Amino acid sequence: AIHCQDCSISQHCIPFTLNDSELDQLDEIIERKKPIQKGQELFKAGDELKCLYAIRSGTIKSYTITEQGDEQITAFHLAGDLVGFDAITEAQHPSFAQALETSMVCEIPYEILDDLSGKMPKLRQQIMRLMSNEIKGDQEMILLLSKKNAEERLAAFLYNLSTRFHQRGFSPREFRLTMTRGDIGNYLGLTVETISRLLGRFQKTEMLTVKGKYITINDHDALAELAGSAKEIK
Amino acid sequence: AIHCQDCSISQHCIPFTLNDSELDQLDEIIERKKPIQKGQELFKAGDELKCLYAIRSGTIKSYTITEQGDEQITAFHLAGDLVGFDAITEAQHPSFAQALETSMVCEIPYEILDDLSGKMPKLRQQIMRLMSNEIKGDQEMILLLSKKNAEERLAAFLYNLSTRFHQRGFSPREFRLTMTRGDIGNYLGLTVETISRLLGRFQKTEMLTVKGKYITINDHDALAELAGSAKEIK
Numbered sequence: 171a172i173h174c175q176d177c178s179i180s181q182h183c184i185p186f187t188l189n190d191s192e193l194d195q196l197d198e199i200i201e202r203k204k205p206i207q208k209g210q211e212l213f214k215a216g217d218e219l220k221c222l223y224a225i226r227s228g229t230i231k232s233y234t235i236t237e238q239g240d241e242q243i244t245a246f247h248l249a250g251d252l253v254g255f256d257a258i259t260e261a262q263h264p265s266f267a268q269a270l271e272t273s274m275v276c277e278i279p280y281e282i283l284d285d286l287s288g289k290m291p292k293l294r295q296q297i298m299r300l301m302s303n304e305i306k307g308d309q310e311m312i313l314l315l316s317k318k319n320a321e322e323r324l325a326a327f328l329y330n331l332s333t334r335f336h337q338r339g340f341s342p343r344e345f346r347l348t349m350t351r352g353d354i355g356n357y358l359g360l361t362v363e364t365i366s367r368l369l370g371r372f373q374k375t376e377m378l379t380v381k382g383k384y385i386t387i388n389d390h391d392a393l394a395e396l397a398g399s400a401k402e403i404k
Numbered sequence: 405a406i407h408c409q410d411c412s413i414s415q416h417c418i419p420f421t422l423n424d425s426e427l428d429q430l431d432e433i434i435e436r437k438k439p440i441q442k443g444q445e446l447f448k449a450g451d452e453l454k455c456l457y458a459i460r461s462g463t464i465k466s467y468t469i470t471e472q473g474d475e476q477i478t479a480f481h482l483a484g485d486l487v488g489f490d491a492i493t494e495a496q497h498p499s500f501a502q503a504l505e506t507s508m509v510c511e512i513p514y515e516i517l518d519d520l521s522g523k524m525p526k527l528r529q530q531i532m533r534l535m536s537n538e539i540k541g542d543q544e545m546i547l548l549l550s551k552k553n554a555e556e557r558l559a560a561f562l563y564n565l566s567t568r569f570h571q572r573g574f575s576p577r578e579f580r581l582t583m584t585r586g587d588i589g590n591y592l593g594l595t596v597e598t599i600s601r602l603l604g605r606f607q608k609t610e611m612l613t614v615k616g617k618y619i620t621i622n623d624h625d626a627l628a629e630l631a632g633s634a635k636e637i638k
């Protein structure tokens with residue numbers, strides 16, 4: 171069934187740069203269980219770190235719960251992303267991960283994986299780079315939350331999704347918003363009605379076409395202009 | 405002169421868990437050059453990744469420059485912190501690092517270090533945990549920027565500095581703000597006058613004493629209450 175040797179996201183997931191034998195060795199330890207249902211949690215905050223989770227297909231959201239019980243989303247993960255890097259420093263998950271649609275996950279036992287990386291230097295370096303890239307994306311999200319207005323925040327979110335789907339071999343132009351608009355506003359710090367009005371405006375300028383949960387980008391230059399700008403003085 | 409064997413922050417820096425021989429091996433590759441002056445940059449965005457930087461003493465700030473030329477700070481680094489993790493994924497620094505006071509830095513050549521970690525599993529695991537902890541702190545900063553008001557943001561910033569200085573063996577009670585208040589507001593998304601009024605209020609409740617750049621915490625319980633709360637409805 172599911173194996174890394176026959177995976178289209180291998181170049182963006184954990185087996186990147188591994189040759190055939192290294193790839194066989196890596197794939198042996200990975201486990202594929204029943205599909206993750208929508209709303210099902212991969213782990214809860216405080217759970218013992220057992221395995222990392224790669225996303226064969228679907229959408230995952232990472233979030234924490236404030237002292238007052240409010241959910242705050244910290245990341246959306248697409249196919250090829252690895253979830254659970256924040257759990258290594260203390261062998262315990264400090265966050266929640268929840269599927270937003272029916273999703274296939276690859277469970278990678280962390281201690282066995284780390285034992286393997288001590289024997290496969292390419293895998294070690296790829297793990298390093300993936301953690302570094304998560305750090306980089308978190309820094310970019312910090313800049314988004316600090317310097318971008320509502321228009322710029324939503325544009326950056328949409329451009330980021332477009333480029334990631336394009337990296338995963340999908341259409342760079344049309345893609346589905348698998349997360350609710352409430353979750354988008356939670357992640358960007360906006361209201362749902364603010365998101366709806368911004369989408370209306372984006373469609374009015376013909377930059378986007380919105381049809382249900384499907385987004386069509388018609389002017390990537392204008393979208394990237396709004397996404398790479400921080401023009402809000404405040 | 406400067407060696408990891410005679411370093412008080414060894415348990416919080418990179419040589420953690422290394423025995424005597426492993427520690428000798430690690431220390432051999434690390435280089436100590438002239439001290440970093442205030443305002444001097446360790447690297448610029450786009451510089452080739454040559455070495456990571458550990459902080460033997462002083463204060464560093466990481467920041468990026470927006471398309472409109474504005475600086476946005478993403479982190480402050482104290483003694484024992486490692487700077488340059490975001491540069492691994494592409495062997496190139498995506499950010500700037502600048503000293504806020506006279507600082508001593510340990511230059512760790514990254515390729516030699518990664519070659520060593522392929523031979524010393526404890527060091528490999530410690531590098532993993534440090535990157536994981538940077539991810540965790542970035543997630544916490546995202547939550548700060550998303551859910552906390554000005555009062556809560558400043559309280560969390562001050563409590564975080566207090567706990568980190570306490571981890572480094574310093575006073576948990578009194579500490580110096582080596583970064584300017586403008587840089588604090590940049591990092592937290594606040595105005596300098598907002599910061600000054602918040603400090604006035606914190607001093608009015610006797611929770612803090614402010615004297616120049618020195619902060620004295622008198623009620624850690626109240627400070628942690630404000631720091632761990634996200635009570636702003638908006």
Ligand code: SF4
Pocket residue numbers: 172173174175177178179180183184185200224225226227250275276
């Ligand atoms: S998603 Fe699963 S099968 Fe595909 S490359 Fe990643 S670990 Fe391998």
Ligand code: SF4
Pocket residue numbers: 406407408409411412413414417418419434458459460461484509510
């Ligand atoms: S600051 Fe320098 S000397 Fe001290 S533990 Fe870190 S690398 Fe070693």
